[PDB]
Symmetry: D2
Amino acid sequence: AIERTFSIIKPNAVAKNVIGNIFARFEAAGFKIVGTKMLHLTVEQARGFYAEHDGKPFFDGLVEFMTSGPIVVSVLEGENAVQRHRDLLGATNPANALAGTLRADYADSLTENGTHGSDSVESAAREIAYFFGEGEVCPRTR
Amino acid sequence: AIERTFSIIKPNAVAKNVIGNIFARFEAAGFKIVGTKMLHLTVEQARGFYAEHDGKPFFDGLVEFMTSGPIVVSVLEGENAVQRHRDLLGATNPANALAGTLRADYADSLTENGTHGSDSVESAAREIAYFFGEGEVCPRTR
Amino acid sequence: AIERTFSIIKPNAVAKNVIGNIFARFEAAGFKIVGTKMLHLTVEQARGFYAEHDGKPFFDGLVEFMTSGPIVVSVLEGENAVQRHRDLLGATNPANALAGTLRADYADSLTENGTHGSDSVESAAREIAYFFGEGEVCPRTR
Amino acid sequence: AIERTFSIIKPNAVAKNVIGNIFARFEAAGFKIVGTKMLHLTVEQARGFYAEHDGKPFFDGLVEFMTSGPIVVSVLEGENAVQRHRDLLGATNPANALAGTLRADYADSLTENGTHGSDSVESAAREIAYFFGEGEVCPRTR
């Protein structure tokens, strides 16, 4: 089915100026970018999004990193998009990600793997709703 | 000096899914993307941005095209960015654009040249302000 | 260990002018291009390289496709290069290749999957020797 | 008219692993790569290609740089290709080359400026003949 999945290009990737390279990979893989914006998360925003993680040891480090610089959040559309996006991204740990995947190609470290992708259709809807408001998701009309 | 300029990736370019290729060209040329967002102009928003052309024969067609599908508006930062961005885009009229420039590579017709770049520091300020509100542009912090 | 593996960019990919896109993927994945050349296989040369398939039903069709237009043959160098190259290419069948892999992004069909990669250190040695003479593989000196 | 022009991706660019990026720009600008090979010029081969500079100012330095690492030499085909290729490369001096041109994007100095392009149809014929033997250029057959 046609799905919409959520993407985050993390601070390290934005800092390295590879937003275009990553977007190009999304498009080459058949995804259509239907929503996108650059923003710099406040700690309030980060803790409201990553709340789930409020219980692990590296939580404080995660929030610090995700609020350390601007990020690009996007909505990608396509058939079976949620799983295909996860496939494109590769393993969470850059060390285990296969050559060519976004984590292998653009990660700088395990915590700084450069990209995030929704893990399910359900989580994608929640993540998209958190960052994209009215008229921010734009269906293709041509 | 370090300047900020305004960019538009037009409906035809978005529809061809070359947003990444264009952003990658900006980054390879030394520009830092400091603000961006995808949106779909309503006729009223398009008329306002192109207000200087109201009453001219080509106006309604320009408005129709610019509202025919989503676009990506961005803010680019770098030394002498206004002029360098224009240099990278190439001549506005594709018939005069040098091979390899963005207009030469991505124009679909003479009219649908694919991209817009501020023509001056003055217009850059006006165009950026039109779409980016108090703080939608995020300077690099690392 | 640092290894060298063999690559073929097939007739369908050369014809679509995506040689640069594929090479860029090799480089982004950490491979160093240490040898490369464009050529157009004769039936004799094609049959000689695919000798191990001589007699099988698809042989003639494989030979016809691989001699239908020019190809680019290359030698890629890098840590665990043979396996990492296979990982980058993805499944032989486009329908089964994960999003983002070279077969998924550039294949037009199962027969015309766009790229070939050595399946072992042993076969890589044989494949490279078939197309590259002494002096044609260039280690990096800077 | 359809022309064939000569290209060299110099040692500094090969060393930075941007061969793919450069080829992708050639293809995006509409050129068809009809010949290419990677080689590492020896002092004797370089003195032969730049023989016209013998007894002239930069003969030694030119040979030293051009033999410092492997290069990629190619034949690009297209309408008015000689001049269009020069337009894509930009000024010889990367500091004065317009943003986005290959000299501006992939070079740091005048001497190590990343790319060479034939300056005329006449020089293209001579340059190609020095690196490609009869039958090595491959016209497209599909």
